[PDB]
Design a protein around this ligand. Structure first.
Ligand SMILES: O=C(O)c1c(N2CCCCC2)nc2ccc(Cl)cc2c1-c1ccccc1
Length: 133
């Protein structure tokens, strides 16, 4: 599959504006401070139509498994109970989370040897760059 580009184990190497993104999402002070320190690994695997994305860190471990285009329940690292849908749009994994009348969009894409994750809440964008572990 094309989703091959994404499979593997990735380590966070840089972050920009994540604190600001988390504020916009509504994450509280203490969670933001601890989550912001974390250097998670992101583990992406595919088994048939099922994609699994795991985040492993000192703060929280999370795991989502899904089929493209099929809405699912997700409890996020900051304990939001959200409705998520993930699609593959021109090679970019696009993940939309809906909760309490709010929405955020997280895009995962390959750029050179990096996996670039861009998170947007209203106007506030954060960029998280990962390299292969
Ligand atoms: O890395 C994450 O999976 C990730 C995340 N994802 C990934 C990119 C940011 C937006 C969606 N969104 C978050 C939203 C709010 C909070 Cl408190 C944490 C996260 C974390 C996260 C950060 C550090 C350790 C563990 C999990």
């Amino acid at each position: 599959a094309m989703c091959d580009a994404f499979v593997g184990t990735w380590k966070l190497v840089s972050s920009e504006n994540f604190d600001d993104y988390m504020k916009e999402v509504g994450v509280g002070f203490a969670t933001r401070k601890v989550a912001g320190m974390a250097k998670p690994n992101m583990i992406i695997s595919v088994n048939g139509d099922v994609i699994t994305i795991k985040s492993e860190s000192t703060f929280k471990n999370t795991e989502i498994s899904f089929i493209l285009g099929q809405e699912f329940d997700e409890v996020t690292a900051d304990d939001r109970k959200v409705k998520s849908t993930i699609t593959l749009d021109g090679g970019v994994l696009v993940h939309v989370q809906k909760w309490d009348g709010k929405s955020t969009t997280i895009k995962r894409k390959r750029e050179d040897d990096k996996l670039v994750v861009e998170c947007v809440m209203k106007g506030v964008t954060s960029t998280r760059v990962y390299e292969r572990a």
